[PDB]
Design a protein around this ligand. Structure first.
Ligand SMILES: [Ca+2]
Ligand SMILES: [Ca+2]
Ligand SMILES: [Ca+2]
Ligand SMILES: [Ca+2]
Ligand SMILES: [Cu+2]
Ligand SMILES: [Cu+2]
Lengths: 718, 720
């Protein structure tokens, strides 16, 4: 027997005692338990459970069998999770597979000592086979394969391994390609700066007493055709510094105009750039509440006493008419695959694969410490790897289920991310309503299933929500919070001499602190298969036309409909006033209209909107990352094209992503198309966002358009 | 003294939950969360013990409570959601007694004519200054309570002002050329008139309708076409569109296309019958109430607050966290949010004197006889407050909501209580903020939003309005649209039929012989914001890409050209979501020397295509009469008499008496009491998924504090 409280809260379960009813309510994920002290039985998700040993109260402390948790929580009454007997071909690599894949490449005569692993992911069977498995239960009859991308010092090599037959299929060095930033790179940078007398000297000038309190940040340097004075061959990283004053927020104490260039191979500082001396903002700015007292609040719980409406079999999620596969990737994070909508007993294809394409956060300041900031969070830092475990009840509602996910770290060792993904159902207002006058009301509530993932890179915290509506609609929201990247300035208020110049590229959000303006650009790769593989891109532009039918009206509301036949034409600006559809020219609904899905790149946002890239077309960042200037893109399906910014975005000399994927202007008529949505924000700071940023959101949407023959939620006919 | 518990409570409107295992009842009703065990002499209300002389009784599997149970428990006091107002708020809506008093005064008036109807009976706005002084300094107003009595003498509008404090008639003013809004009896008249019309009955028989009694009419405003519609500006008219009742509870799905009747409400007769091509009435049963559907089993989900709410409702005043505001009801525009302040560490700062729906419009794009004239001004012409739809507990609002009742006067001057008129509820809205510093302990807080929801149904349309108070100072205003679509009867069954192309030129074929005619939903919000004081100024911040002149590899930089918007004509503009518009207080600054401000966002997204402006050529009349349709942002100087974007009397109006008029004089908006008007809407191109019933579609607007505070608003109290 063990103390119930310790044991349970140690298990991650929530414990509630109701003295009035002499009842304990235990909650953890899909399990909702009720147990009375001394009772021979308990209740699990509405179901009675016989107990070997009743709960025991001693000294008014609850005690339970040391087998309690297993007997009750893993009893079987909680059906949230189901056993997967036949593994989905898209299941991410297991811990064993990761270790097996590493062995295979390490057994090769070519494997160099100290080699690192930028990414170890599943090399998936072909699309056709996967769909056949999901739709016809046909086995892929294939061997598990893995892509093993390594970083030999600074050299990239791509290998492919065959896990079943445990053999190396290929070993290909990738010329000119720079590797992404790995964990250890962060330590080297701090160490190299720590051992540099020069740097300590530069730091000395700028008023810094203890060079040991200096906190560094490793930043990608981009590419400027040589204008930045950096050689293209060398694996580089720029270093921005802050002074640790003990407030837990070194971001609030920038050391302006001091930039160091570090060569990770030579393990040394190869260039120190010094600008005018700006006193370090010293005032403590904690964001963790150490200096605060939250106001008392009454409790709020969202409960599901009988369990969840969804079931999770392996990674396969089932919920109402929805069925999809959820996996994890070290680079882009969560991947939603083989998405189908069960249309009255028939599973219809909606999306083969959906995930984050890639993202970028570019700044608008030309000064030495800023002109180069263009963070490619997923491509250069690895968002899946940097996943931030969900804070139960806070980062997600109390009725959510938290999933653990496994990936490989940069040394090839399995890595399990606790509470990596949040799954939860939520009330979203009335689904539909009609109060006919003098008649009984008609109302149904809307239910949405949310798959939430949070990744934190440096000072930024990003939230991604994949929202499944019961009615067939899919929403994709991106929230942004964290700590702002600030610039040290001499003005304390807007009444100071330098205030005018100090705020030229950003707002004065605190004394001597300017939140430099920038943008948040998110790109989503959505391999939509609208009720099938072969689709077409159709445009519907609402227009005002002169009236030719007679009567008092001079004009009418009509629609200019037309096909967009190629990739170049498909790459365009999005007007929320227009309609863009991905149709299946081979299938129609009951009214003769081709079944389709409405693509909405911009469905709102809480920060000013990014019309495009706040960059002149001659800027290198602009050249390299085309996906930034267009909100909508459609390319022919190709398993090798998955990143808007290109596979190897670090110090890239040109566009290897969407710019390249659409480059050949291929046909998009009745063929397998891939939709790419670019949505972003223009961030001009406020005091309300300092020291910590209130979460800002952007919304995207995918609506069924004549995909169904009527209101999808009415239900089956009697 | 005993009653069957389950029945009594259900009837009372309380949610009843029985837990066989715990032998416990859980009762929920608004701010009250109750726990009670059979036979127990004690019950729990919001975590507090309540003694019961007569326990709940379990008789033969049946629960029983005393005839006094509901009162003793629910109205015990342990539920502190509602408190008693000591000193009456000057903005409190007229009481049932005041309504009846105002009706007596004008009825005792020399000129009062029998059969005079009442379009609107509302409190006459006390001096805005006196009202703030009361809310901020608790200084009594001290001016007699007045009421505006707008009546319809047949088709004539008269404006009476009564002094309730002294029981005096202050003024009786006939309003020339003005038309009155559509009243409830007008609906009954239209049907009777069509029912008694020999010719109309004949018109329907030739269109396939065997039983004239099965014909259902709808009363639509005709607008104004400079006589082009062949209708005299003098008469009080309404056009009539009909549907055939086939018994599926959804007559909207059975249009009698190309048949329009003009009804002169004063003469009580059809003064004109416009007939077009005969189109066979769509007959297939298309019920939307589920009568023909299988009810799928879903697992229960409840949002609970066991110890009560975080907000308190004293009279009509609502207190929640740092927010304080007054909530009342108006027969025309519905809910009104007044004297809105934000408690800043002990100091209540002004945010908004009053906000509410300004007005709205739903214009169609079909030139045909049964459509060309459809340009609905729902609130002005139909009165949305009056048409408020009682909230369906748990469905129209989350289960943790508190439902308020609201009282207004009906068109005959009699007090009218709207059950569940407004919904108040707190909700979880993801993390307020978060930062997971690597290798460090996580920092996360949840976001809480207080939502004020109101639903109004006008004919086939169902509108939902949410006033969202973010704990961090932000205020959101969302509009949701649902209900049944106004459809056009057409010959084509599928897009393959010969007439399909013509049948769909103005809308999508959403069902056999049914076309969801294209139209737009344009909402306008009147927001009298007092950003930390009365005197404010309109400022523009345009994020621009400026060439780099500071040196380095960069060719360009991201800068902002800021500038003030001096007057009304200039403030009336389109809104570019890529830009920033602020209502600042030039007389007050935050800790960094920046003018305390609020960011105005007329466009923050939507689930339907967005309306770029009115889908009308500029030579159209509906476009002329109403200018609020084209601009998303407007700023005018405060005027207690300017409240409607479309004008006070929009029925058959011949010119712009709304926002076109209010800004017409191009007055200065510099350091003065400003009023912000936000326009947003959708362009609705139908699809099968929206028939027979439309899934709720939403549009969002936002008001964000901009340097109004000195730091993250929700950081918490400082121990330093
Ligand atoms: Ca291509
Ligand atoms: Ca596809
Ligand atoms: Ca004016
Ligand atoms: Ca004002
Ligand atoms: Cu930002
Ligand atoms: Cu509509």
């Amino acid at each position: 027997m063990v103390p119930m409280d310790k044991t349970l809260k140690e298990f991650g379960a929530d414990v509630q005692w109701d003295d009035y009813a002499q009842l304990f309510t235990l909650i953890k994920d899909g399990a909702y338990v009720k147990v009375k002290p001394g009772a021979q039985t308990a209740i699990v998700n509405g179901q009675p459970l016989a107990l070997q040993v009743p709960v025991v109260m001693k000294d008014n402390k609850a005690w339970v069998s040391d087998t309690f948790i297993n007997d009750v929580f893993q009893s079987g009454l909680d059906q949230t999770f189901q056993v997967e007997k036949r593994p989905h071909p898209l299941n991410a690599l297991t811990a064993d597979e990761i270790k097996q894949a590493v062995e295979i490449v390490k057994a090769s005569a070519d494997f160099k000592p100290n080699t690192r692993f930028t990414e170890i992911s599943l090399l998936p069977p072909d699309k056709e086979a996967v769909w056949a498995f999901a739709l016809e239960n046909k086995p892929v009859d294939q061997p598990r394969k893995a892509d093993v991308i390594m970083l030999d010092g600074k050299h990239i090599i791509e290998a492919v391994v065959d896990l079943q037959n445990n053999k190396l299929l290929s070993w290909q060095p990738i010329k000119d390609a720079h590797g992404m930033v790995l964990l250890d790179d962060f330590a080297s940078v701090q160490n190299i700066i720590n051992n540099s007398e020069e740097f300590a000297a530069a730091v000395k000038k700028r008023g810094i007493t203890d060079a040991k309190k200096v906190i560094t940040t490793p930043l990608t340097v981009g590419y400027f055709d040589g204008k930045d004075g950096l050689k293209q061959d060398a694996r580089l990283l720029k270093v921005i510094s802050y002074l640790d004053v003990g407030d837990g927020n070194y971001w609030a104490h920038p050391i302006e105009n001091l930039v160091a260039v570090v060569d990770l191979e030579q393990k040394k500082i190869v260039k120190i750039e010094e600008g005018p001396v700006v006193p370090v903002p010293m005032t403590a700015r904690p964001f963790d509440g150490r200096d605060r007292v939250a106001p008392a609040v009454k409790p709020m719980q969202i409960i599901e006493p009988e369990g969840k409406n969804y079931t999770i079999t392996g990674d396969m999620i089932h919920w109402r008419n929805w069925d999809f596969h959820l996996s994890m990737n070290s680079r882009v994070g969560p991947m939603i695959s083989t998405v189908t909508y069960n249309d009255n007993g028939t599973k219809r294809k909606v999306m083969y694969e959906g995930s984050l394409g890639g993202m970028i956060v570019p700044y608008g300041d030309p000064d030495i410490g800023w002109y180069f900031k263009a963070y490619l969070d997923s491509g250069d830092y690895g968002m899946g790897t940097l996943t931030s475990p969900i804070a139960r009840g806070k980062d997600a509602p109390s009725n959510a289920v938290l999933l653990n996910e496994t990936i490989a770290d940069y040394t090839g060792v399995p890595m399990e991310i606790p509470r990596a993904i949040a799954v939860f159902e939520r009330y979203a207002g009335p689904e539909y309503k009609h109060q006919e006058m003098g008649q009984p009301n008609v109302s149904t509530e809307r239910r949405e299933l949310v798959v939430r993932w949070i990744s934190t890179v440096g000072n930024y915290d990003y939230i991604f929500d994949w929202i499944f509506h019961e009615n067939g609609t899919i929403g994709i929201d991106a929230g942004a919070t964290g700590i702002e990247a600030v610039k040290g300035v001499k003005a304390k208020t807007m009444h100071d001499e330098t205030a005018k110049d100090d705020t030229r590229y950003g707002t004065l959000i605190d004394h001597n602190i300017v939140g430099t303006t920038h943008q948040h650009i998110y790109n989503f790769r959505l391999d939509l298969d609208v009720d099938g593989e072969n689709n077409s891109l159709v445009a519907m532009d609402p227009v005002v036309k002169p009236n030719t039918a007679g009567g008092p009206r001079t004009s009418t509301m009509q629609v200019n409909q037309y096909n967009i036949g190629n990739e170049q034409d498909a790459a365009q600006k999005f007007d929320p006033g227009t309609i863009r559809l991905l149709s299946n020219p081979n299938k129609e609904n009951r009214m003769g209209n081709p079944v389709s899905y409405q693509i909405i790149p911009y469905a709102g946002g809480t920060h000013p909107v990014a019309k495009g890239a706040q960059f002149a077309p001659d800027e290198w960042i602009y050249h390299r990352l085309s996906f930034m200037d267009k909100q909508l893109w459609v390319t022919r399906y190709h398993p090798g094209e998955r990143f808007p910014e290109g596979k190897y975005p670090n110090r890239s000399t040109h566009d290897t992503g969407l710019g390249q994927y659409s480059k050949d202007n291929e046909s998009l008529d009745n063929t397998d198309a891939v939709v790419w949505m670019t949505t972003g924000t223009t961030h001009v700071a406020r005091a309300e966002e300092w020291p910590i940023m209130p979460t800002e959101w952007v919304h995207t949407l995918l609506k069924p358009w004549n995909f169904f023959d009527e209101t999808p939620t009415l239900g089956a006919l009697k």
